[PDB]
């Protein structure tokens, strides 16, 4: 622990701190969530998570030299908090958690988008609850309306030549996580077609030239699933 230190973090996070004071608090909490056992994460709990999500909302609502670092450090704290079942369960109990992870998919902050996309991908493949992919898509829809963009555009932007290989891989990994776990053939075919129409068709040609095994693994999953679906439609 200590257990007392968890309560101290909550009190600090609720205190109205900003800028580098906030980042310094977040960095200390990120270490504690990584180094302490799950029991400590449970002591920090739903209330600790809620304090983190309230700040992240505020950071969006007020459009700050430290904003992008504070948003990403919060995402790092969520990455640690969600590295166990209790954390996952507690995040999925929130009303706004998934939406805030989707709003973290900003390709202009690529390492934050990578971290958030990985967390989302892991939710989608969970045995339970089922159909987390649907909740992710609901939140992508809400973000699209709020940002006035097409809903898959952030994922496409992540695949543009110019981005890091790690971001490209995380984008295609989330695409696969949205499609592959779905039981309904016609839904898989639909989503795939929506991505193709937005521009994935052209992008894929560029991705296949990349000599990176992690990319090849995701392209393989994507192409096979596509092939099976079209087979099943005949």
């Amino acid at each position: 622990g200590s257990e007392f230190s968890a309560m101290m973090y909550i009190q600090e996070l609720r205190s109205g701190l900003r800028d580098m004071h906030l980042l310094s608090c977040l960095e200390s909490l990120r270490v504690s969530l990584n180094n302490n056992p799950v029991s400590w994460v449970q002591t920090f709990g739903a209330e600790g998570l809620a304090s983190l999500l309230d700040i992240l909302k505020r950071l969006h609502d007020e459009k700050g030299n430290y904003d992008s670092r504070n948003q990403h450090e919060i995402i790092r704290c969520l990455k640690a908090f969600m590295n166990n079942k209790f954390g996952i369960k507690t995040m999925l109990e929130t009303e706004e958690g998934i939406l805030l992870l989707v709003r973290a998919m900003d390709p202009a902050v690529p390492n934050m988008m990578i971290d958030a996309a990985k967390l989302l991908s892991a939710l989608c493949i969970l045995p339970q609850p089922e159909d987390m992919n649907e909740r992710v898509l609901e939140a992508m829809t809400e973000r699209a309306e709020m940002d006035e963009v097409e809903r898959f555009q952030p994922l496409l932007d992540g695949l543009k030549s110019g981005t890091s290989i790690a971001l490209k891989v995380g984008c295609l990994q989330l695409i696969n996580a949205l499609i592959t776990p779905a039981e309904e053939l016609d839904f898989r075919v639909h989503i795939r077609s929506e991505l193709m129409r937005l521009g994935l068709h052209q992008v894929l040609q560029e991705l296949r030239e990349i000599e990176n095994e992690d990319m090849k693994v995701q392209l393989c999953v994507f192409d096979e699933q596509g092939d099976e679906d079209f087979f099943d439609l005949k």
Binding site: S121, I125, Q173, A177, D214, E224, Q225
Partner: peptide, 15 residues
């Protein structure tokens, strides 16, 4: 099924 093996490969990639 082939889809379930694929899901397992996605999980292994995330780990």
């Amino acid at each position: 099924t082939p889809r379930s093996a694929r899901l397992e490969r996605m999980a292994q990639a995330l780990a």
